[PDB]
Structures are given as C-alpha cells and as structure tokens.
Design a protein around this ligand. Structure first.
Ligand SMILES: Nc1ncnc2c1ncn2[C@@H]1O[C@H](COP(=O)(O)OP(=O)(O)OP(=O)(O)O)[C@@H](O)[C@H]1O
Ligand SMILES: Nc1ncnc2c1ncn2[C@@H]1O[C@H](COP(=O)(O)OP(=O)(O)O)[C@@H](O)[C@H]1O
Ligand SMILES: [Mg+2]
Ligand SMILES: [Mg+2]
Lengths: 470, 53, 484
C-alpha cells in the first residue's frame, strides 16, 4: 500500500517518503524487513510527499531506503473481553508469553472525544476506606481521580492500595496502563494480581487488563500506551455497558515523552522545556477518559510532580482535568504519616454539604481549619517556646497533632513496608472518630495511640496497651 | 500593600527546613513526649482503679 | 564494502557522504582506523560520531561499513581487565580472549523474564546494610555532592564482594563492573590500585572512559559495561555495576547531540536524556528461574551541585532508581562518615532483601534513630532524662555505631554483632566518644575468640534465642572487661 522508503533516521523520529498517496496523519506505518514489528505513526506531512513519523519501538538497524508499508488505519489493538488477564504492548501485542490475544474486535488507539451532550452530571461517592481521602477529599464514582505526588512519596503504593480495596470489590472490569514506570513494578503487579485472583491464568474470570509501556520503551512508545489503555477502557464502556476502572501510573510520562521528541519533530520549545502542544495533547487524551451517559469510567491517574514543584506545567495542566485531587506531600511522609496526603491541598468537587452531608462537610472543614491554625501556631512556637503558648494554643496544637496522626492509616499493600496489618475504615467511622477528636473526647489519650491505627476504637485500644506496657 | 512583593504564609518557618524549623519540630516533640508519659501514667492509674473496683 | 566520503569533519562529527547501506547505530571504520557510530542518517549525508581524536580524519577520507550495530566483547574473560568503552584492553596485560560480542543497545528484560528481588546485595557498610538495604536486581542511586564519598561507598561494596567470591557457592558470588565516566586517568588508576591491593580486581571489569576519551566513548561506556554485566545476568550468574558519574555521561550526550545539530532543551541536555539514563538502568533486573535466575545490580552515582537534588538530571535519575542513598557534605564535616542521611535516604526493602538476623536489630535501630532525629535537633538544652535524654543518648550511641572507616567492609554477621551491642542498650553507659573504640575492640574480640558465634549467625541467617543468649554473654563480659 503506497510502499514508502525511509529517508532519515534521527533518534526516534523517522522520515518516510511515499511515492504513492501520502498516508494521513496518525495512521500506522509498518517497517518491512525487521525481525520484530516496528510501527511508525505519522506525525507531520513535511512536504514533497514525505511524512515525519515517530517510531513505536527501537530505531536501531533501520537503513535509509528500507521499505515501509501503510496500514491505512491508526494503530489498532486487540480489544474485547479476551484482553482481560492479558498483558499487551502499545501496538497491542501480547507480552505475557501466553499466545495471541484472540479478540474479534479491533479498535484504533486514536479516537474523538465524547461530546458535551454525552456528559453525565451525576456525582456519587466512592468509599475507598482511607480516612484522609474519604473525609477530606472524597472520591466520586465515575469521576477522574488524581494522585499528585513527587518521587518516593506514595503514589504507586496508594494506587495499588486503591486497586486492592476498590477494584477487587468492584464487579466491573478494570484496566491498568503502566505508562513510563519501572518494569519491576509491572511484574510485581502482574504476579500480585495472579495470586490475588484478579487475573486467572487458568479460567476466564480475570477482571483486569494490563497495558504496559515501561521506561525501557522508546519515547514514542511511552506517549501512546496511555491511549491504548484508555481505548481498552472505552471498549469496556461503549461496546459493553459496564463500569470500568482505568488505573494509569505516572500519566506525567505521557507529557514527558512528547517533550523528548518535540525538538526532533521541529517545534520551538515552550516554557521550562515542554512541547508547545502540551495542554492540547493532554486534553485530547484526558477528554476521552470520561464517564459518558452510556457507561462510567472511574479513572485513578498517578501524576509525578517534577522536583515536587506543583507549579510545573505538566502537573499544573492536569489539575483542571481531574474532579478529585489528592496531593502527597513529602514533608508529611518525612513526618511518617502514611498515606502522605496533604490535608490542606487535596480537593474534591463532591466536597459539598449538599452532597457529602452536613456532618461530613462540617467535620472535614473543621479538621482543615484546625490544621491551618496549627500551621500558624508553629511559627510562634519556633520563637516563643512550647512552654510559652497559651493553654488554648497548646490545646489546639495537641488536637491538631492527634488529628494528623489519626490521618495515617496502615495499608494492606504496605504491610510489607510498615509491618502493621492493613486496616479499612468505613466512612461513618472516619467521620465519627474525627468528630470526636475535634470535640476533645479523646484528649486524655496520647498522640502515639492515634498513629498507624484504623478506627478510633483501635486508637483507644492501642493507648491501653501502652499503659499496660508502661 | 502592593501584591508584587513576596508574601509569607503560615508554616514558612517549618517549611524552610532551617535551624528555626528544626528547633520548632524538636520543641513540639519534647513537650508532647513528656505529656504522653503523664497521660499514659494517668491511664495506667485509671486502669488500676477500675481493676480494684 | 559500501563506503562514503567525509564531506566535513569537525569536533568529532563526520558528515560522511555515501554509506547508502549504512544501518542506524552501526559502527563504521574510517581510513585511519578510527571507528565511528552512525547516528544522524540524513537524506544526503550520515552523521558519524568518531570514537577518538578527529585530527586523523580529514575531508575526503573513505569510511567503510563494519556491518554490525555497535557491540562490545563480552564474557568472563574480561574479569580482572581494565577495558575502554569499545572493549579494548588498556591494562597492557594482553588481548582479551572474548569469544562473544553483545550489542551495547539491547532491550531490557520484559515483565515476564523478571522475578522479585530476593538475594541480599551486601555492601559491607553498616549504614547501607542496616537502614537502606540493597537487594540483587535493585537499582540504588548513590547521590551526593562533590567529595562526599559516593565512590568510596561503591569501592567498599566492591571490596566486600571478596568474602563471597572466594567461597564455594556460585549463588553468593557477585562479579563487579566499575564504569568510570569522566574521571581522570590518575583517579581510575588509584581505584584499580586499591582493588588490586585488596585482591578485588580478580572479579571486576573496570570499563574506563576518562576525560581524555572522546565524548562518544564516554556516552557509550555505561551501555558497554551494562552489556558486560548482562552477560553474567543472562547466564545465571549475579553481577554488580557502578555507573560512576552518570552525570558526566549526560554532558557527553549533550556534546554529542549538540555537535550533531540536534536542538537543545532544558540546560541544553538533549530531550532524550531521560531515555538515555532509563534504558541503561532498566536492564538491571533479577531474572526468574526459567531465565537462569541471574541478577544485575546497578549503583549509579550522580553529583549534585550545591546539594540541589531538584536539578534536571538528578531528578531524572532519582525517578528511575528504586532507592537513593543521599550523601550530604554537612554530615561529612560534622563527623558522620559515611555521610548517609538515613532520614532522607530511602531504599525499597527488596521484598525482604535483608537477612533475618540483620532485620531483627535493624528494625529497632531504625525506630530509635528516627525518634532520636525527631527530638535531638535543638542544641538548646533547657530537662527530661527519662524521655529525651534517654532517647538522645541511645541515638548518639547508634550514630557512633553507624560511623565506619574507608576500605574496611564488614561482614554481615559482624555488623549484626555490633548493631546488637548498640541496640540492646549495652553501650548506653559507654562514653559517646569511646563508642568507636568499643566497636573496634569488640569486633576484634568476637572475630578472634567467639568466631564460632559469627559462623553460626552466618550459617543460620537468623539470631535465635540461644544465639541471642550467647551474644548477651559475650557483650556483657567484654563490656565489663572493656576498660581495664
Ligand atoms: N568512610 C570514610 N570516612 C572518612 N573519610 C572518608 C570515608 N570515605 C571516604 N573518605 C574521604 O572522603 C574524601 C572524598 O571521598 P571520595 O573520593 O569517595 O569522594 P567523591 O564524592 O567520590 O569524589 P569526587 O567528587 O572526586 O568524585 C576523601 O578524602 C576520602 O578519603
Ligand atoms: N503506607 C505507605 N504508603 C506509601 N508509601 C510507604 C508506606 N509505607 C512505607 N512507604 C514507603 O514509601 C515509598 C513510596 O514509594 P512509591 O509509591 O513506590 O514511589 P512513588 O512515591 O514515586 O510512587 C515506598 O517505596 C515505601 O518504601
Ligand atoms: Mg512508584
Ligand atoms: Mg567520585
């Protein structure tokens, strides 16, 4: 089909000249003669019937003049119920060594976004079981959740815990898109779900599909794996009227990969160094990941915050695309509170007394206010001394510290790290416990009793153990 | 005043991570570490009292 | 041999005209014998990076295709040999008898060929092996400023590997590879001298790309060493590699790309510096049993100017690595040597990549040190002996315990012994400035008299109750007899 020839191989950007009709942009080009499959996606019509293409795999071995065919369609991936329990690449190739993925329906990774009249206006609440999330920044069923955080702050652990708590319980299928992450973590997740039962290698009851492009992959591949995963999720939303859970790790890699190829594509660098087409491409991806009126897709996306700078363009743009945001602060993790959710930075759209209820809203706002007042008091402490503050100031500091400790919750996925058994706190118990702490009913209990506990019943019980060991 | 001028916020002392921030961090711990001991001892006395009765 | 004509040769970049059958990333040979790599295949010319001085190359030279993508002589015949980026021996001990050549740009193992990290990669450093354990197949970053001791940590691990290499079991044997990128020849020679006086060279391959060596050579060196380690990893053997100054590889990539007219980005580093470092480190993995069960451990070193770990390359490398060992100048000049900031230094446990005996004392040591750090950061003492002064004294004791000298790796059992001595409170009464003397004396006393205890600890891998009682006796007796 209009067999082209490679005219230049610079980095991942390969230019092909088509003597016959030029392939339209975003179509997939297959390089002939390579032992494996190398797919070149058209990016620009440079001119003189030449297309600038970004390779989806390594460009080593390419020789000028090599024949390149045109598929005629954007990269098409095997999609359907048969992808569950299978690991697939960006170009939809089985990488689990379990044979070909035999799906009767193929879909292209590139597609238009859902229309405005297809947007749903409902806002439910998803009880993850995490005290910080459910109280301060409640997640919503179908909403777009964002796990903002730096490096080594808890994004991967938190997302795996969310998979364990929600996805396992959720009857609908789930999709995990490992965009630009460590390959070791991908294998860990694959093995963990095998033993957990979410992926069954024997039967056909698997409930989670895996799309992985790790950082070992070339920049081009790392910029489309998210599109492949969301295409699979879209199939599980439109073709099948089911609720889906799309878990993507480090969406930031989607933006970063574009920055690694924009210069070769021929674009003038934008601020800091990202590609000029940052917001547009990010929206094109994100708008597709929504809950239409046909079906719901509750998406949890981990977003790496470069150098813990939220003002960085990549995390900054993604804030507008997410209904519920949970920012993991390194300073809190240094304090030891795990999860390291920043109580005064995390926000959710359903945090509305009409939606979450008056009591829930009041308790959450009280917690946030007391923590703000504690932040204010710390500056005074640094100069005056703790033994100089007023009794009201000391009471506020004590209660705020107790609340901060009670925010910490041991995770089942973190049982290996912390050593404590994982706990899941119901929303009612979370609200009741934080309300009691705000009231002061547990002021007599030491702060240590509130650290790494589940419900306040565990909190008071721990205090008694310490007294018995005193 | 003029918005352009750099504006400080609550917690800046601790956020800096300097000597004054560390002093505040340690000072808070030293106070409540002692308070917890008093509270824990009081709880132990309460437990002993209810054991007696 | 499809050949080309050098249109322009400048600053190591040859825009060869011809080579119509040249492969991308393929080595090409110049008329003078200099070898280059084709990177920028353009419609009319081929951008070739010469692996050496470009003075010999002149316009009109004939460049012949070698016919193979750049590869490095690979195998176990390179053990004990100081080689360059292209596998050419520079130790003057003779030609390397390698029979196998492996491409420097091979892909990393996939999801399936990997298994969870299990084996402990002992470094011989108390602080590393106790509070930030490193497992085999785990990429740990030795990040720090200049003259902070990162190379000291790496070489100490290299020397530590001896006690396992000279044994019998091949599971514990860990061949080492040191990749020197940008370090001067005198420094590399000093490192080799240390290794060959500690008889560690026998199991090390020292790939060297010094400052004199061309930017392409410095850029290729890490991949060469990684492939040499991949030889052991894919044959069931376990290997360790230290990419010294991966930042110096970044500047080599910057020079190579900019001289290749590739547009610059952040700090003029080419946009693919992240991939440059990612594809290298991702290769380090623990192969599953079906794939031989071998492992490749990577310890990249990154120099941070003024301790700004928020800089571009430091953040890029930090994201890639599993854990980071933070070395701070202030600790070094405050006496904590090695200057490991255990508070900020993090390392994924490697799914229990620490021996049980070490774990038992390390957990409590970690908790005590955390509490000590939280409370003893004032230096403005007012009056709480039971609460604070008790805690901070133990913290000082444990810090003195963590302090360790250079080129003296300790076996894991000896570390367990000393950490036991400190963590059980037996040294709380000992003077804070005499703790180090006690450490040395107790180490010697155990090794000489109670060597059976160390053997039992090592063999079992766990300190049982009976072994604990024996340790109680030993430490109490020596502590009583420590000061004559
Ligand atoms: N454990 C130690 N205790 C005390 N001093 C040490 C220790 N390890 C290394 N040093 C000393 O610290 C100094 C710097 O060590 P080293 O050469 O490892 O630093 P570096 O960060 O790798 O240096 P460079 O910037 O030259 O690459 C040397 O004087 C060395 O002897
Ligand atoms: N409950 C917890 N939640 C999150 N992280 C924890 C917890 N307990 C310990 N940790 C440590 O914090 C680290 C978080 O790192 P991880 O989430 O894997 O990378 P990132 O934070 O970049 O996503 C873990 O590797 C773990 O060692
Ligand atoms: Mg992670
Ligand atoms: Mg060094």
């Amino acid at each position: 089909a209009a067999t082209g020839r490679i005219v230049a191989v610079i980095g991942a950007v390969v230019d092909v000249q088509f003597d016959e009709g030029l392939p339209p942009i975003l179509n997939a080009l297959e390089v002939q003669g390579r032992e494996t499959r190398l797919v070149l996606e058209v990016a620009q019509h440079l001119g003189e019937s030449t297309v600038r293409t970004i390779a989806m795999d390594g460009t080593e071995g390419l020789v000028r003049g090599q024949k390149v065919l045109d598929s005629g369609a954007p990269i098409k991936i095997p999609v359907g119920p048969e992808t569950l329990g299978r690991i697939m690449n960006v170009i939809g190739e089985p990488i689990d060594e379990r044979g070909p993925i035999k799906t009767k329906q193929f879909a292209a990774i590139h597609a238009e976004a859902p229309e405005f009249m297809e947007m749903s206006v409902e806002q439910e609440i998803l009880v993850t079981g995490i005290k910080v999330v459910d109280l301060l920044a409640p997640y919503a069923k179908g909403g777009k959740i964002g796990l903002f955080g730096g490096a080594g702050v808890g994004k991967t652990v938190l997302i795996m815990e969310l998979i364990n708590n929600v996805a396992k319980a959720h009857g609908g299928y789930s999709v995990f898109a490992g965009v630009g992450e460590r390959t070791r973590e991908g294998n860990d997740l694959y093995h963990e779900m095998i033993e957990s039962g979410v992926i069954n290698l024997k039967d056909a009851t698997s409930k989670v599909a895996l799309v992985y492009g790790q950082m070992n992959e070339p920049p081009g591949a790392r910029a489309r794996v998210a599109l492949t995963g969301l295409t699979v999720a879209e199939y599980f939303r439109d073709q099948e009227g089911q609720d889906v859970l799309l878990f993507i790790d480090n969406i930031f890699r989607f933006t970063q990969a574009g920055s690694e190829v924009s210069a070769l594509l021929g674009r003038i660098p934008s601020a800091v160094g990202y590609q000029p087409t940052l917001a547009t491409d990010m929206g094109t991806m994100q708008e597709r990941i929504t809950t239409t009126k046909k079906g719901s897709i509750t998406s949890v996306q981990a977003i790496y915050v470069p150098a813990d700078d939220l003002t960085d363009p990549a995390p900054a743009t993604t804030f507008a695309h997410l209904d519920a945001t949970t920012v993991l602060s390194r300073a809190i993790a240094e304090l030891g509170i795990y999860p390291a959710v920043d109580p005064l930075d995390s926000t959710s759209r359903i945090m509305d007394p009409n939606i979450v209820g008056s009591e829930h809203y009041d308790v959450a706002r009280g917690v946030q206010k007391i923590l703000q007042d504690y932040k204010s008091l710390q500056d005074i402490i640094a100069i005056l001394g703790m033994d100089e503050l007023s009794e009201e100031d000391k009471l506020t500091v004590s209660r705020a510290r107790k609340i901060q400790r009670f925010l910490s919750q041991p995770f089942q996925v973190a049982e290996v790290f912390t050593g404590h058994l994982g706990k899941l706190v119901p929303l009612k118990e979370t609200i009741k416990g934080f309300q009691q702490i705000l009231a002061g009913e547990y002021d007599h209990l030491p702060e240590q009793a509130f650290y790494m506990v589940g419900p306040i019943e565990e909190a008071v019980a721990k205090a008694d153990k310490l007294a018995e060991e005193h | 005043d003029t918005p352009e001028g750099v504006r400080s916020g609550a917690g800046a002392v601790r956020d800096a991570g300097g000597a004054f921030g560390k002093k505040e961090q340690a000072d808070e711990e030293r106070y409540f570490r002692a308070r917890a001991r008093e509270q824990l001892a009081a709880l132990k006395k309460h437990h002993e009292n209810e054991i007696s009765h | 041999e499809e050949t080309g004509r050098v249109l322009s040769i400048g600053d190591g970049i040859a825009r060869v005209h011809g080579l119509r059958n040249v492969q991308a990333e393929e080595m090409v040979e110049f008329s003078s014998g200099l070898k280059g790599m084709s990177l920028n295949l353009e419609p009319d010319n081929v951008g070739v990076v010469v692996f050496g001085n470009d003075k010999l190359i002149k316009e009109g030279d004939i460049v012949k295709r070698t016919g193979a993508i750049v590869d490095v002589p690979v195998g176990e015949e390179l053990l004990g040999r100081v080689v360059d980026a292209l596998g050419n021996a520079i130790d003057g001990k003779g030609p390397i008898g390698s029979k196998t050549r492996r491409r420097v740009g091979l892909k990393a193992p996939g999801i399936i060929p990997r298994i969870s990290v299990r084996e402990p990669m002992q470094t011989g450093i108390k602080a590393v092996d106790s509070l930030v354990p490193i497992g085999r197949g785990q990429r740990e970053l030795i990040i720090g400023d200049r003259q902070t001791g990162k190379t000291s940590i790496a070489i100490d691990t290299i020397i530590n590997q001896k006690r396992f290499n000279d044994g019998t079991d091949e599971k514990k044997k860990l061949y080492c590879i040191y990749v020197a990128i940008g370090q001067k020849r005198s420094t590399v020679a000093q490192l080799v001298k240390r290794l060959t006086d500690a008889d560690a060279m026998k199991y090390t391959i020292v790939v060297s790309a010094t400052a004199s060596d061309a930017a392409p050579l410095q850029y290729l060196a890490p991949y060469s060493g990684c492939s040499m380690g991949e030889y052991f990893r894919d044959n069931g053997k376990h290997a360790l590699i230290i990419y010294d100054d991966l930042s110096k590889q970044a500047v080599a990539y910057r020079q190579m790309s900019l001289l290749l007219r590739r547009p610059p980005g952040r700090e003029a580093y080419p946009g693919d510096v992240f991939y440059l470092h990612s594809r290298l480190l991702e290769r380090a993995a623990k192969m599953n049993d079906a794939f031989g069960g071998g492992s490749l451990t990577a310890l990249p070193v990154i120099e941070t100017q003024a301790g700004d770990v928020s800089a571009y390359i430091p953040t890029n490398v930090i994201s890639i690595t599993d854990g980071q060992i933070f070395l701070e100048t202030e600790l070094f000049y405050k006496g904590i040597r090695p200057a490991i900031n255990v508070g900020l230094s993090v390392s994924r446990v490697g799914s229990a990549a620490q021996t049980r005996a070490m774990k038992q004392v390390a957990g409590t040591m970690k908790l005590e040190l955390a509490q000590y750090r939280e409370v003893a950061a004032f230096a403005q003492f007012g009056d709480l002996d039971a609460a604070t002064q008790q805690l901070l004294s133990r913290g000082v004791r444990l810090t003195e315990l963590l302090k360790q000298g250079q080129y003296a790796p300790m076996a894991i059992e000896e570390q367990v012994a000393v950490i036991y001595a400190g963590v059980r409170g037996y040294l709380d009464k000992l003077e804070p400035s005499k703790i180090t003397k006690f450490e040395n004396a107790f180490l010697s006393h155990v090794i000489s008299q109670h060597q059976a205890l160390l053997g039992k600890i090592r063999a079992d891998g766990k300190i049982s109750e009976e072994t604990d009682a024996k340790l109680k006796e030993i430490v109490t007796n020596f502590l009583a007899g420590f000061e004559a």
